[PDB]
Design a protein around this ligand. Structure first.
Ligand SMILES: Nc1ncnc2c1ncn2[C@@H]1O[C@H](COP(=O)(O)OP(=O)(O)O)[C@@H](O)[C@H]1O
Length: 308
């Protein structure tokens, strides 16, 4: 186990590209919980994830779940977009009876109740009703939260990861030489205190900051994401060898500055998977080929080597 903990950044980067500054902070925070220098009555981790969207917030969250608890299923997501009113609370903990399916339970509690070794992701944390924070704050004090039926749900074995892009438009400046390692984590801290109570922020083990990806990185994701496709082709002994520009073509169409790498997968679907099929069906690509994918003025181009 100690081998996993000391090496924690390697095991994480296996799926998460760059963000070393982000990755180090969570791996140091986790090393602190284990080894025993924390309050035991607190979740294994609480982190504020700040940065743009599409740049890996969730990836890390899934990865952290996969590497820390043996699976990406070990991660409960709650979107704070759908919890913005008085009727918010009653979903998270399931606060009837009488009121609809309380006999079902509350989804935060119930999820944590059935799967206590998990990673809980709250997105858009700013959107939540100020009433929701009290609930989340007690979860960080005692590490324990009583549901509506008087079942106390035990969060002490979890990792809580909140996301927001409140600090983003003032992190796109840091990016430009000006501000280096810290100073962004710190100047952004001032904008958070303008939205969040300090009783909440000082429970958070860390506010981690997530820089945008650069065309050399997008490229690296571009590769990882073919994996399934590549695997699936392999069964037919087909290889899929790309070209530098071809990679760049993907990224270009696949990376919205405000929606990060979110689009790319479908992009790959539309620009690469689609035409590929025609050819495979049309017999342009036979079983057992080295496909040479590349760019053109009407999009990607596929060629095969003169057999032999
Ligand atoms: N650092 C990263 N490492 C690997 N893949 C990434 C990274 N950042 C983004 N991606 C890719 O982008 C897609 C969505 O990323 P995601 O974490 O959902 O972004 P966000 O949550 O910020 O919108 C994933 O399918 C993933 O493959």
């Amino acid at each position: 186990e100690r081998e996993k903990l000391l090496r924690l950044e390697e095991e994480l980067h296996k799926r998460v590209v760059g963000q070393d500054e982000a990755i180090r902070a969570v791996a140091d925070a986790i090393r602190r919980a284990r080894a025993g220098l924390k309050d035991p009555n607190r979740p294994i981790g609480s982190f504020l994830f700040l940065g743009p969207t599409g740049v890996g917030k969730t990836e890390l969250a899934k990865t952290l779940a996969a590497t820390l608890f043996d699976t990406e299923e070990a991660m409960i997501r709650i979107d704070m977009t759908e919890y913005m009113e008085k009727h918010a609370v009653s979903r998270l903990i399931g606060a009837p009876p009488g009121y609809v399916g309380y006999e079902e339970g509350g989804q935060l509690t119930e999820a944590v109740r059935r799967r206590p070794y998990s990673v809980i992701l709250f997105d858009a944390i700013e959107k939540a009703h100020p009433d929701v924070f009290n609930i989340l704050l007690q979860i960080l004090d005692d590490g324990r939260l009583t549901d509506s039926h008087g079942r106390t749900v035990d969060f002490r074995n979890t990792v809580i990861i909140l996301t927001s892009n409140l600090g983003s438009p003032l992190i796109l400046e840091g990016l430009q030489k000006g501000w280096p390692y810290e100073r962004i984590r710190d100047e952004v801290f001032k904008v958070l205190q303008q939205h969040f109570r300090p009783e909440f922020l000082n429970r958070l083990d860390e506010i981690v900051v997530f820089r945008p990806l650069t065309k050399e990185q997008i490229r690296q994701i571009v590769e990882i994401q073919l994996s399934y496709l590549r695997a699936r082709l392999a069964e037919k002994r087909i290889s899929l060898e790309l070209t530098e520009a071809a990679k760049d073509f993907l990224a270009e169409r696949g990376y919205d500055p405000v929606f990060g790498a979110r689009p790319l997968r479908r992009v790959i679907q539309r620009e690469l998977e689609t035409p590929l099929a025609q050819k495979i069906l049309a017999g342009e690509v036979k079983e057992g080929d080295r496909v040479q994918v590349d760019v053109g003025p009407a999009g990607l181009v596929f060629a095969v080597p003169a057999r032999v």
